[PDB]
Structure formats: structure tokens, C-alpha cells
Design an enzyme around this catalytic site. Structure first.
Site, PDB file in Angstrom:
ATOM      1  N   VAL A  17      27.219 -20.313   4.363  1.00 11.39           N
ATOM      2  CA  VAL A  17      27.451 -21.327   3.319  1.00 11.39           C
ATOM      3  C   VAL A  17      28.561 -22.330   3.664  1.00 11.39           C
ATOM      4  CG1 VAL A  17      26.439 -19.883   1.484  1.00 11.39           C
ATOM      5  CG2 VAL A  17      28.925 -19.913   1.761  1.00 11.39           C
ATOM      6  N   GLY A  18      29.566 -21.868   4.407  1.00  8.46           N
ATOM      7  CA  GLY A  18      30.700 -22.694   4.811  1.00  8.46           C
ATOM      8  C   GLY A  18      31.931 -21.867   5.111  1.00  8.46           C
ATOM      9  N   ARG A  19      33.055 -22.551   5.302  1.00  5.39           N
ATOM     10  CA  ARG A  19      34.326 -21.904   5.627  1.00  5.39           C
ATOM     11  C   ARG A  19      35.242 -21.811   4.412  1.00  5.39           C
ATOM     12  NH1 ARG A  19      33.653 -25.669   9.762  1.00  5.39           N
ATOM     13  NH2 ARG A  19      32.979 -24.773  11.763  1.00  5.39           N
ATOM     14  N   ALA A  21      39.446 -20.646   3.249  1.00  5.55           N
ATOM     15  CA  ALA A  21      40.787 -21.015   3.722  1.00  5.55           C
ATOM     16  C   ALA A  21      41.013 -20.463   5.126  1.00  5.55           C
ATOM     17  CB  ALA A  21      41.861 -20.518   2.768  1.00  5.55           C
ATOM     18  N   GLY A  23      38.277 -18.103   8.018  1.00  4.75           N
ATOM     19  CA  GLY A  23      36.999 -17.445   8.263  1.00  4.75           C
ATOM     20  C   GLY A  23      35.765 -18.186   7.786  1.00  4.75           C
ATOM     21  N   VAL A  24      34.653 -17.456   7.739  1.00  2.00           N
ATOM     22  CA  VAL A  24      33.339 -18.009   7.411  1.00  2.00           C
ATOM     23  C   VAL A  24      32.735 -17.197   6.272  1.00  2.00           C
ATOM     24  CG1 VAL A  24      31.097 -18.781   8.329  1.00  2.00           C
ATOM     25  CG2 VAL A  24      33.022 -18.529   9.893  1.00  2.00           C
ATOM     26  N   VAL A  25      32.335 -17.890   5.211  1.00  2.00           N
ATOM     27  CA  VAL A  25      31.634 -17.261   4.095  1.00  2.00           C
ATOM     28  C   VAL A  25      30.130 -17.373   4.344  1.00  2.00           C
ATOM     29  CG1 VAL A  25      31.486 -17.039   1.575  1.00  2.00           C
ATOM     30  CG2 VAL A  25      33.551 -17.983   2.610  1.00  2.00           C
ATOM     31  N   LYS A  38      32.855 -12.527   3.895  1.00  2.00           N
ATOM     32  CA  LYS A  38      33.804 -13.387   4.592  1.00  2.00           C
ATOM     33  C   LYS A  38      34.216 -12.773   5.924  1.00  2.00           C
ATOM     34  CE  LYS A  38      37.641 -16.284   3.034  1.00  2.00           C
ATOM     35  NZ  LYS A  38      38.846 -16.206   2.167  1.00  2.00           N
ATOM     36  N   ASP A 131      48.689 -21.228  -2.662  1.00  2.00           N
ATOM     37  CA  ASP A 131      47.655 -22.145  -2.161  1.00  2.00           C
ATOM     38  C   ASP A 131      46.640 -22.536  -3.259  1.00  2.00           C
ATOM     39  OD1 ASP A 131      46.247 -23.733  -0.273  1.00  2.00           O
ATOM     40  OD2 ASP A 131      45.180 -22.016   0.597  1.00  2.00           O
TER      41      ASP A 131
HETATM   42  C1  LIG Z   1      34.525 -22.954  -0.237  1.00  2.00           C
HETATM   43  C2  LIG Z   1      33.045 -22.769  -0.041  1.00  2.00           C
HETATM   44  C3  LIG Z   1      32.678 -21.728   0.996  1.00  2.00           C
HETATM   45  O1  LIG Z   1      32.529 -22.424  -1.358  1.00  2.00           O
HETATM   46  C4  LIG Z   1      31.170 -22.280  -1.615  1.00  2.00           C
HETATM   47  C5  LIG Z   1      30.703 -20.989  -1.935  1.00  2.00           C
HETATM   48  N1  LIG Z   1      31.653 -19.918  -1.933  1.00  2.00           N
HETATM   49  C6  LIG Z   1      31.554 -18.626  -2.402  1.00  2.00           C
HETATM   50  O2  LIG Z   1      30.563 -18.183  -2.992  1.00  2.00           O
HETATM   51  C7  LIG Z   1      32.759 -17.726  -2.150  1.00  2.00           C
HETATM   52  C8  LIG Z   1      32.771 -16.427  -2.575  1.00  2.00           C
HETATM   53  S1  LIG Z   1      34.221 -15.615  -2.173  1.00  2.00           S
HETATM   54  C9  LIG Z   1      34.874 -17.017  -1.404  1.00  2.00           C
HETATM   55  C10 LIG Z   1      36.152 -17.146  -0.767  1.00  2.00           C
HETATM   56  O3  LIG Z   1      36.991 -16.246  -0.681  1.00  2.00           O
HETATM   57  N2  LIG Z   1      36.374 -18.412  -0.241  1.00  2.00           N
HETATM   58  C11 LIG Z   1      35.480 -19.434  -0.315  1.00  2.00           C
HETATM   59  N3  LIG Z   1      34.299 -19.370  -0.886  1.00  2.00           N
HETATM   60  C12 LIG Z   1      33.978 -18.080  -1.467  1.00  2.00           C
HETATM   61  C13 LIG Z   1      29.345 -20.802  -2.222  1.00  2.00           C
HETATM   62  C14 LIG Z   1      28.475 -21.888  -2.202  1.00  2.00           C
HETATM   63  C15 LIG Z   1      28.936 -23.165  -1.895  1.00  2.00           C
HETATM   64  C16 LIG Z   1      30.281 -23.393  -1.589  1.00  2.00           C
HETATM   65  C17 LIG Z   1      30.696 -24.812  -1.294  1.00  2.00           C
HETATM   66  O4  LIG Z   1      31.355 -25.407  -2.127  1.00  2.00           O
HETATM   67  N4  LIG Z   1      30.342 -25.376  -0.099  1.00  2.00           N
HETATM   68  C18 LIG Z   1      29.135 -26.227  -0.014  1.00  2.00           C
HETATM   69  C19 LIG Z   1      28.642 -26.423   1.475  1.00  2.00           C
HETATM   70  N5  LIG Z   1      29.748 -26.892   2.348  1.00  2.00           N
HETATM   71  C20 LIG Z   1      29.298 -27.074   3.741  1.00  2.00           C
HETATM   72  C21 LIG Z   1      30.870 -25.943   2.287  1.00  2.00           C
HETATM   73  C22 LIG Z   1      31.397 -25.811   0.841  1.00  2.00           C
END
Ligand SMILES: CC(C)Oc1c(NC(=O)c2csc3c(=O)[nH]cnc23)cccc1C(=O)N1CCN(C)CC1
Length: 295
Positions: A17-19, A21, A23-25, A38, A131
Site C-alpha cells: 500500500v505504501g511506506r 514513518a 518500513g513498508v505497509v 509493516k 511525531d
Molecule cells: C501512510 C499510508 C501507508 O497509509 C495508508 C494505509 N495505511 C494503513 O492501513 C496502516 C495501518 S497501520 C499503519 C502504520 O503504522 N503506518 C502507516 N500506515 C498504516 C492504507 C491505505 C492507504 C494509505 C495511504 O494513505 N496511502 C495511499 C497510497 N500511497 C502510495 C501511499 C499512502
């Protein structure tokens, strides 16, 4: 609090889904439930991983992400999946953007402060997030419920308190500054210090000199007071998060319909950049109406 040891064979990774703060989610399935995993990627994120795992486990609150467990091979956290994405993505992210109301903006900020207030009341030492910013705030339940994530400290120049980037004696009152900026941001649907830009240090300098984001035309004085107090130079003049939760709870009387899911689209164009004052994205007409009925 309770934690689960995870076998990676029980995880089925669906898509990245993306990064965060760090790592990679990745969207995944575990125990036939919708999870987000993550994974560390740099190996230099080990300190951050240990910190988040340490904090998230002892933390237990409706407005902080559920940590389901951790897998050590490969090294990853198993958390809840946020359907709505980040708050930053909802405000400023991919078009089409969702429409939201003043009630949502106020509701989000209340929920955020509720989580932070919980963190600041931890025993025996307070837990500072360090943060707080919209990319580290997640939206669930059709964008009506906000959760705090990314505890890796427990590109942030716009939300950081002056005493923090000065390396100075900072307390939990730095989180209060961050919240102040977030409040401005959801009301205006503008990136803080977008006008300034440049690299990080250009903002840091500006904030350090006492630059705050522009005041909002037609903003209620009680909300304006809370906002401008939250972002004082002197950390002691900022309110406690306990006080913010109480004030915000009481203002919610004049912000109904906050539980309505984000569903209507919005074609968003921005007014002129710097006039001294900015237009709010949200409408305060109904606030003033309900207020004068009481007062
Ligand atoms: C920040 C991002 C990953 O956030 C999303 C998430 N994040 C989560 O479900 C999530 C669950 S726990 C957790 C955590 O600890 N850090 C960041 N994200 C998460 C899901 C779907 C879209 C997004 C979202 O905005 N991107 C949309 C697509 N873009 C390329 C990246 C951002």
C-alpha cells in the site's frame, strides 16, 4: 497488554500500500482477518521497530491502532488495516478527494487529542508521540474514526515545535503544538507552510522566528483561541491535552453529524496563497446558528 507471536506462513500478503514513518505497509490476510503488515526494509529501522513494538503493546485505546502481533522471521508488525488511508491522504491526497464537513474536522481533532491525552497519562512516565502529523493519523469506519499510528519516535518540520528542533528541554507540550497545526490544517485543507516550502531548514527557521500558518477568516473565537494557544513559543503557555479533550468534547454540541461516512466527492480549488488571512474549507454557519440558540 496482550500480544500474538506470528508464523509468517499464516500471513497471506495481498498488495503493498505504501511506506509508513519507517518500513513498508502491505495489505494482508491473517487468521482470515483484514490486516496491515509493516515490514522493516532498511535494517537501520531496527531501533524504530523495537520502539513501536514496545509502545503499541502497552498502549490500549479506541483512537490508537490495534497491534495484533509481531513476526520475527521476517521481522514485521501485524496491525489493523485502515480502509480510509491516512488523514493526510484524505485531505491532500489522490483525486477525487472526499468532501468533509466542519463536524468531521472537529471530530477528527477531538479523537486525535483523545488518543494523545491517553498517551500523556501513562504510568510512571508520560508517553510522548514526538511525531504527530496527518500522515501518522489513520481513518477507519468510513472516515469517521481516527487512529494514531507510527510510534517510531515515541519531513515533519511543519508540525514540529520550536524547542524540538532546537534540541532543547522538550516535554509532552510539543505534541500540543503538533495538534495545533493539525487543527489549522483540517479547517483549511491546506498544507502548513506550503508557501515557504524549500528544504526542511527554511520552515524550521520560519517557525523559530515565530511564523505560524495564516489566521482563518470567519473562524469562531473559542476555536481560534485554542489553536493560537497550542502554538505558543513558550511551551508552558500551551494547554494540556487533558484540557483540549474537555474543550473539544464541549464544542461538539455545535458540530452535529460527525458520524456520517465520507461518501460525497469534492472538486477542490484553492483561494489566493497569502492575503494575511485564509478562507476555511469548512463552513461555520451552522456552528454560529446553534451557538446563538444556546447563548
Ligand atoms: C501512510 C499510508 C501507508 O497509509 C495508508 C494505509 N495505511 C494503513 O492501513 C496502516 C495501518 S497501520 C499503519 C502504520 O503504522 N503506518 C502507516 N500506515 C498504516 C492504507 C491505505 C492507504 C494509505 C495511504 O494513505 N496511502 C495511499 C497510497 N500511497 C502510495 C501511499 C499512502
Amino acid at each position: 497488554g496482550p500480544l500474538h507471536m506470528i508464523d509468517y506462513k499464516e500471513i497471506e500478503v495481498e498488495e503493498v500500500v505504501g511506506r509508513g514513518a519507517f518500513g513498508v505497509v502491505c495489505k494482508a490476510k491473517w487468521r482470515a482477518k483484514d490486516v496491515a503488515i509493516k515490514q522493516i526494509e532498511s535494517e537501520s529501522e531496527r531501533k524504530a521497530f523495537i520502539v513501536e513494538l514496545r509502545q503499541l503493546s502497552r498502549v490500549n485505546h479506541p483512537n490508537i491502532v490495534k497491534l495484533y502481533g509481531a513476526c520475527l522471521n521476517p521481522v514485521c508488525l501485524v496491525m489493523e488495516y485502515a480502509e480510509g488511508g491516512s488523514l493526510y491522504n484524505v485531505l491532500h491526497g489522490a483525486e477525487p478527494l472526499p468532501y468533509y464537513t466542519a463536524a468531521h474536522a472537529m471530530s477528527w481533532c477531538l479523537q486525535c487529542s483523545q488518543g494523545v491525552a491517553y498517551l500523556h497519562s501513562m504510568q510512571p512516565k508520560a508517553l510522548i508521540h514526538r511525531d504527530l502529523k496527518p500522515p501518522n493519523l489513520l481513518l477507519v469506519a468510513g472516515g469517521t474514526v481516527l487512529k494514531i499510528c507510527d510510534f517510531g519516535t515515541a519531513g515533519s518540520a511543519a508540525w514540529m515545535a520550536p524547542e524540538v528542533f532546537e534540541g532543547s528541554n522538550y516535554s509532552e507540550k510539543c505534541d500540543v503544538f503538533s495538534w495545533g497545526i493539525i487543527l489549522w490544517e483540517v479547517i483549511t485543507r491546506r498544507k502548513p507552510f506550503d508557501e515557504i516550502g524549500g528544504p526542511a531548514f527554511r520552515i524550521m527557521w520560519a517557525v523559530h522566528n515565530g511564523t505560524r500558518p495564516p489566521l482563518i477568516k470567519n473562524l469562531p473565537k473559542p476555536i481560534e483561541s485554542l489553536m493560537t494557544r497550542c502554538w505558543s513559543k513558550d511551551p508552558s503557555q500551551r494547554p494540556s491535552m487533558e484540557e483540549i479533550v474537555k474543550i473539544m468534547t464541549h464544542l461538539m454540541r455545535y458540530f452535529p453529524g460527525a458520524d456520517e461516512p465520507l461518501q460525497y466527492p469534492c472538486q477542490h480549488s484553492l483561494p489566493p496563497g497569502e492575503d494575511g488571512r485564509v478562507e476555511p474549507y469548512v463552513d461555520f454557519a451552522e456552528f454560529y446558528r446553534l451557538w446563538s440558540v444556546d447563548h
